[PDB]
Design an enzyme around this catalytic site. Structure first.
Site, short mmCIF file in Angstrom:
data_model
loop_
_atom_site.label_atom_id
_atom_site.label_comp_id
_atom_site.label_asym_id
_atom_site.label_seq_id
_atom_site.Cartn_x
_atom_site.Cartn_y
_atom_site.Cartn_z
N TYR C 26 0.84 -1.18 0.00
CA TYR C 26 0.00 0.00 0.00
C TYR C 26 0.87 1.24 0.00
O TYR C 26 2.03 1.22 0.43
CB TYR C 26 -0.94 0.01 1.20
CG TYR C 26 -0.25 0.22 2.53
CD1 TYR C 26 0.27 -0.86 3.23
CD2 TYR C 26 -0.13 1.48 3.08
CE1 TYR C 26 0.90 -0.68 4.44
CE2 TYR C 26 0.50 1.67 4.29
CZ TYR C 26 1.01 0.59 4.96
OH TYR C 26 1.64 0.77 6.17
N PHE C 36 2.27 9.71 3.22
CA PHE C 36 2.57 9.57 4.64
C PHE C 36 2.93 8.15 5.05
O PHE C 36 3.39 7.95 6.17
CB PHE C 36 1.38 10.04 5.49
CG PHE C 36 0.17 9.16 5.39
CD1 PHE C 36 0.03 8.05 6.21
CD2 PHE C 36 -0.84 9.43 4.49
CE1 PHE C 36 -1.08 7.24 6.13
CE2 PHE C 36 -1.95 8.63 4.40
CZ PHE C 36 -2.07 7.53 5.22
N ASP C 37 2.75 7.16 4.17
CA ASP C 37 3.10 5.79 4.50
C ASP C 37 3.19 4.98 3.22
O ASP C 37 2.50 5.28 2.24
CB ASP C 37 2.08 5.16 5.45
CG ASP C 37 2.56 3.85 6.03
OD1 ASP C 37 3.72 3.47 5.76
OD2 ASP C 37 1.79 3.20 6.76
N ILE C 56 -7.86 0.05 10.35
CA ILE C 56 -9.02 0.92 10.47
C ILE C 56 -10.18 0.39 9.63
O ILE C 56 -10.01 -0.42 8.71
CB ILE C 56 -8.68 2.37 10.10
CG1 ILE C 56 -7.95 2.44 8.76
CG2 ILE C 56 -7.86 3.02 11.19
CD1 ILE C 56 -7.62 3.84 8.32
N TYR C 82 -8.91 7.50 10.90
CA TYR C 82 -8.62 7.90 12.27
C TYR C 82 -9.58 8.95 12.80
O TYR C 82 -9.76 9.04 14.02
CB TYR C 82 -7.18 8.42 12.35
CG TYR C 82 -6.17 7.37 11.96
CD1 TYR C 82 -6.00 6.23 12.73
CD2 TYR C 82 -5.41 7.51 10.81
CE1 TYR C 82 -5.08 5.27 12.37
CE2 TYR C 82 -4.50 6.55 10.45
CZ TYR C 82 -4.34 5.43 11.23
OH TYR C 82 -3.43 4.47 10.87
N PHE C 99 -5.45 5.53 -0.52
CA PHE C 99 -4.48 4.45 -0.50
C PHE C 99 -4.44 3.76 -1.86
O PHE C 99 -5.47 3.61 -2.51
CB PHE C 99 -4.82 3.42 0.58
CG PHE C 99 -4.63 3.92 1.97
CD1 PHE C 99 -3.38 3.90 2.56
CD2 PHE C 99 -5.69 4.41 2.70
CE1 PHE C 99 -3.20 4.36 3.84
CE2 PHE C 99 -5.51 4.87 3.98
CZ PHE C 99 -4.27 4.85 4.55
#
Lengths: 144, 903, 107
Positions: C26, C36-37, C56, C82, C99
């Site tokens: 991902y 961010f990831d 999540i 979140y 994502f």
């Protein structure tokens, strides 16, 4: 040409005679190259032939050249400098000392035929004495 | 948004065929074009970042994606600016925005996919088809001020093939009715192949070659522009000749016919070489003899129109002129021998030959204009039924074969004139400096990185001139500017060997010009403070005869190897890392004690180059012409940033377009809302509308001011700016059967021309009042409006969420006091500071913090050259497979991103 | 929430079932488009089991709709993400997450 320049430097009448010749005949040295010490063909021709002389000196011989230049500053005869180099065969620029003596030496090895030369200590002294004398007198000439 | 961001990104590069198509009034180019790209291999993730692969069209002037980092997060390819329009299987890409587009069986471009691209310059529109299935989206109403070419942008891990039709890739799907295969657009003087775009670097036998700017055609280069001749009136003493000239040219023409083997026959049988017109000019039919009589008359009239002076000189020579004898064998069934006048005595002067060239050019251009008016167009393959010709191009672009084929007839005509005894004075060829480009900004400068500056010793390096044009090479100071010519100031000592000059604070003759393949050796001796140049091992001397080129050089901060290449030039800079690669170091410099510049460096020396991409930079505090004053707010005025022209109304004054913006942008919200003179607290605290004004001072002509906003990707340094020059495009999405769902307009400049608010009566007379243009933006609805002197204007704009807009002003100064950014407010409208700064989000008091400043557009800037480049292999796979592009080795870079500027 | 848009097709038959372990790559981005990831940055697939509430709700509901080998874009609203709290230092409060998810295999 180097011996002729050495004579030009040592003997001092020869300088006035060259200068008088050039001024009296009004021959322009610049025309030949393309009055002054720079215009003097005696030094100009040697400055043109000098690379061919330095080319027979291996890079390792730079320190010996400096020492011989010091002797000629001490006003030693050619035989005296020859003997000095002969006995101080050591004090020869070491390759590991600096990278300069590494790449210079590699390039110098590169030239074909430069493998049997420098085997003869008499040969090394010959060349160092000659080029050192020429450089010393050229130094005196260029800086009065 | 405050700290600089970092990330690893893939290098991306673009490839195109040398096919260029455009539109212009009276152009000779067809309008509709079609090509295909077939994808053989794609590795979706060769690195941690998704593989880049986009196909589409791009505009010649403006699409300049340089390797490394550009707009956004780098990796710029097709669609990452408003000069290119791309498709990636799922999205239509333009202006660095990706818009999803529906298609049967959506998926990112995968192996065995065929993308068909259609360009219709009439609308204009660009459309796509994936595996024959229509892509439900189109680009339209974009700018047409250049030439369009097919392009694919990609990262490492792809193998694709252009299919251009004909023998250059057989189409997998039938082109839509009317569109032409792109292989027909290859110009006569060129051969089809694949090339990079705006490359400053390439590989070559001994190492990397540095490349100067590439000279690019313009869409107007296809417009034939001949000189008018109808208004010319033939003189009588030219008229008398006109006939005889017609007969003589006919004699020569028939002579050539019979030489090639033409025989006389009643009908046009070229197969049997029959020729009814092979009969004598006197016997030739009346319409045809008259037709020739015209072409003659046009020849003389063109001679006059160019300005040539033609006058009778010697009737004795005319009498002496004798027709050459014709062999009896030359007698065809015509029963006639086409006797030409022997003009062997006549010699053409060089000026006369140039004149002959000009006549041929004018004639061909007239013919081309006529055919275009008929409705013909260019095509590499002839098609008479379709009115497509391989010659219908302006004369300058024709291949030598046809050019000489015409010059021969024209030269024979002028020979006939001279033999009949006519003084033929060519016009005085008054010099006309084309100055198509800014010389200071044109040639690309390549220098070593500042950290390599040498402050002592004796250093050597070499520069081989692959071409023989404008190139300069030498030593520069670390603070060398990118927009100044090398050696035009005190920051560089260089040698320009196209004519043999030394450059430092000006030019001086020195040395001799090089030829192709010559190697210039540059030496700097910082113990003697001298610079020496050698050409192929021989020291270059001045006219005075001095060996050195420069003397009495102050060391300062050191020196760097530097070179500059003009357009179309190629050099090879050898800094001597591999001492064996040097070609003349031993011949001159080794024994003199000079050391190669990069002798003992583990890694190749990094270089920087003068990138010609205009960028916004703060106005220098010591700029010779422009001064910015930060005016504090008062009880009656808000904070202001005022511009003044220091050197106005004096010799050396600089008067040119000035593009200004403010350092900080206002950013529109992520989501738009669904569908006496004191601020009302609730209104002012819940409003999302922000305001700023520009005061154009009296004496500054409002007709020379544009006020509004720019996006982060505005890079146009146009010295003749108009609101018509603004990049714009419309992306339209609909269903299968039309039914447009959305139509978004994209641009990078949102401004109003100051001339709109000049009263019609006031027009033509200077005013004594100031013009205040206010700009309003609703960050919650995306609406942008303008007011002039308090009156609302009719210009409005609509932007998408997240859009960043910088306040901007484009002005051509006409007074010492030009403009003033007024960062004020209106009733129930918040100031810019409230939108620009988070801490001031709810502060209605106008402010101008130190970070807010005026920036101007600078045309050139220094840019680091990547140490490694993508290895792209291009080759013609076959007459049916097409042209294959392949790139398999990954290459990544760490990118530093400035958040506010989005670059 | 979560809306799924295909990028590359999968087998179209084998879908994750509650209790199975999904292996994925991902790349996470904020709705603005800020990364961010990314599991590809760490060069190691991320494994998670459906139903254990390890990821999540956006992932829980989205990856369930993807077939093995499929690549897809998941757009997850704040409520499924979140949400109001916001993963401090990474995810701002009330942030929509985008994502780019490839479902390598099931186990």
């Amino acid at each position: 040409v180097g011996e002729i320049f050495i004579y030009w430097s040592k003997s001092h009448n020869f300088k006035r005679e060259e200068q008088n010749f050039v001024v009296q005949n009004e021959i322009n040295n610049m025309s030949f190259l393309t009055y002054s010490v720079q215009t003097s063909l005696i030094v100009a021709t040697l400055k043109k032939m000098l690379p061919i002389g330095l080319n027979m000196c291996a890079p390792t011989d730079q320190d010996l050249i400096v020492l011989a230049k010091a002797r000629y500053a001490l006003k030693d005869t050619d035989e005296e400098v020859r003997e000095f180099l002969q006995n101080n065969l050591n004090l020869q620029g070491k390759v590991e000392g600096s990278p300069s003596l590494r790449w210079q030496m590699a390039l110098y090895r590169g030239v074909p035929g430069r493998e049997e030369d420098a085997d003869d200590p008499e040969k090394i002294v010959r060349r160092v004495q000659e080029v050192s004398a020429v450089l010393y007198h050229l130094d005196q000439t260029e800086h009065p | 948004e405050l700290l600089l961001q970092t990330n690893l990104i893939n290098y991306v590069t673009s490839i195109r065929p040398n096919i260029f198509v455009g539109r212009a009034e009276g152009s000779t180019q067809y309008g509709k074009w079609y090509f295909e790209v077939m994808v053989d291999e794609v590795a979706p993730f060769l690195t941690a970042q998704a593989t880049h692969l986009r196909v589409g069209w791009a505009l010649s002037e403006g699409y300049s994606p340089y390797p490394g980092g550009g707009e956004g997060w780098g990796g710029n390819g097709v669609g990452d600016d408003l000069y290119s329009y791309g498709f990636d299987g799922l999205h239509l890409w333009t202006g660095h925005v990706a818009r999803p587009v529906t298609s049967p069986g959506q998926h990112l471009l995968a192996p065995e996919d065929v993308v068909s691209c259609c360009l219709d310059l009439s609308v204009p529109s660009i459309s796509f088809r994936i595996n024959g299935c229509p892509v439900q989206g189109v680009f339209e109403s974009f700018n047409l001020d250049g030439l369009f070419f097919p392009v694919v942008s990609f990262s490492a891990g792809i193998k694709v093939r252009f299919l251009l039709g004909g023998r250059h890739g057989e189409f997998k799907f039938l082109p839509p009715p009317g569109y032409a295969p792109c292989h027909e657009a290859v110009l006569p003087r060129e051969r089809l192949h694949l090339q990079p775009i705006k490359e400053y670097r390439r590989e070559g036998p001994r190492g990397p070659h540095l490349v100067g700017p590439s000279r690019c055609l313009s869409h107007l280069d296809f417009v034939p522009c001949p000189v008018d001749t109808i208004q010319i009136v033939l003189p009588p003493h030219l008229e008398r000749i006109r006939e005889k000239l017609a007969e003589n040219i006919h004699e020569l023409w028939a002579l050539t016919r019979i030489e090639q083997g033409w025989t006389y026959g009643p009908v046009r049988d070229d197969n049997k070489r029959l020729h009814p017109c092979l009969v004598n000019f006197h016997s030739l039919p009346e319409p045809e003899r008259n037709y020739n009589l015209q072409m003659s008359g046009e020849t003389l009239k063109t001679l006059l129109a160019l300005g040539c002076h033609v006058g009778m000189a010697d009737e004795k020579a005319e009498d002496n002129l004798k027709k050459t004898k014709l062999p009896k064998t030359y007698m065809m069934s015509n029963g006639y021998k086409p006797a030409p006048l022997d003009l062997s005595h006549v010699r053409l002067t060089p000026a006369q030959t140039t004149l002959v060239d000009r006549l041929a050019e004018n004639g061909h251009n007239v013919w081309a204009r006529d055919r275009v008016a008929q409705g013909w167009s260019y095509s590499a393959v002839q098609d008479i039924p379709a009115r497509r010709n391989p010659r219908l191009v302006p004369y300058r672009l024709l291949d030598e074969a046809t050019k000489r084929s015409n010059r021969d007839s024209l030269c024979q005509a002028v020979r006939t004139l001279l033999g009949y005894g006519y003084n033929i004075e060519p016009p005085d060829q008054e010099p006309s400096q084309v100055d198509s480009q800014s010389r200071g900004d044109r040639a690309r400068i390549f220098r070593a990185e500042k950290s390599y500056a040498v402050q002592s010793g004796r250093w050597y390096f070499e520069f081989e001139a692959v071409t023989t044009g404008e190139m300069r090479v030498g030593w520069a100071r670390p603070e060398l500017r990118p927009d100044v010519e090398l050696g035009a100031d005190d920051l560089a000592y260089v040698f320009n060997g196209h004519r043999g000059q030394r450059w430092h604070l000006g030019s001086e003759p020195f040395g001799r010009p090089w030829q192709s393949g010559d190697v210039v050796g540059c030496m700097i001796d910082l113990t003697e403070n001298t610079i020496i140049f050698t050409l192929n091992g021989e020291v270059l001397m001045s006219d005075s005869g001095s060996e050195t080129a420069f003397r009495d050089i102050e060391i300062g901060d050191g020196f760097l190897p530097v070179c500059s290449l003009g357009p179309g030039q190629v050099g090879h800079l050898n800094l001597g890392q591999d001492v064996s690669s040097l070609r003349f170091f031993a011949i001159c410099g080794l024994q003199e004690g000079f050391e190669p510049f990069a002798i003992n460096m583990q890694r190749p020396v990094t270089t920087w180059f003068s990138k010609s991409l205009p960028q916004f930079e703060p106005v220098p505090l010591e700029h010779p012409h422009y001064e910015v004053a930060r005016m504090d707010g008062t009880v009656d005025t808000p904070p202001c940033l005022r511009l003044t022209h220091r050197t106005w109304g004096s010799q050396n004054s600089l008067v040119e377009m000035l593009f200004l913006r403010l350092s900080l942008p206002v950013q529109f919200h992520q989501h738009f809302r669904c569908t006496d003179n004191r601020d009302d607290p609730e209104i002012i605290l819940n409003t999302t509308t922000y305001y700023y004004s520009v005061r154009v001072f009296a004496g500054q002509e409002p007709s020379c001011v544009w006020v509004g906003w720019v996006t982060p990707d505005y890079h146009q340094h146009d010295m003749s700016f108009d609101l018509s020059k603004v990049r714009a495009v419309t992306v339209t999405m609909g269903d299968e059967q039309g039914n447009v769902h959305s139509s978004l307009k994209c641009s990078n400049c949102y401004m109003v021309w100051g001339g709109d608010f000049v009263s019609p009566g006031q027009q033509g007379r200077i005013s004594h009042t100031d013009l205040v243009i206010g700009c309003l933006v609703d960050l919650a609805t995306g609406l942008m409006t303008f007011t002039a002197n308090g009156k609302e204007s009719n210009t409005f704009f609509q932007v998408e969420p997240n859009t960043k807009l910088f306040p901007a002003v484009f002005v051509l100064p006409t007074h010492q006091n030009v403009v003033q950014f007024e960062l004020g407010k209106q009733k129930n409208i918040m100031p810019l500071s409230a939108a620009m700064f988070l801490s001031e989000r709810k502060n209605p008091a106008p402010q101008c913090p130190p970070r807010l400043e005026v920036q101007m557009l600078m045309p050139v800037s220094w840019s680091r050259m990547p140490n490694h480049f993508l290895q792209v292999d291009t080759r013609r796979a076959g007459e049916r497979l097409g042209w294959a592009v392949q790139c398999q080795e990954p290459l990544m870079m760490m990118a530093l991103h400035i958040p506010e500027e989005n670059r | 929430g979560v809306q799924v848009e295909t990028i590359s097709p999968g087998d179209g038959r084998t879908f994750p079932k509650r209790g199975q372990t999904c292996v994925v790559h991902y790349t996470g981005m904020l709705e603005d488009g800020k990364k961010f990831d990314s599991s590809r940055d760490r060069n190691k697939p991320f494994k998670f089991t459906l139903g254990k509430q390890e990821v999540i709700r956006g992932w829980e509901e989205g990856v369930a709709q993807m077939s093995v080998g499929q690549r897809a874009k998941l757009i997850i609203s704040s409520d499924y993400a979140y949400g109001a709290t916001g993963h401090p230092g990474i995810i701002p409060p009330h942030a929509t997450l985008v994502f780019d998810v490839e479902l390598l295999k099931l186990e």
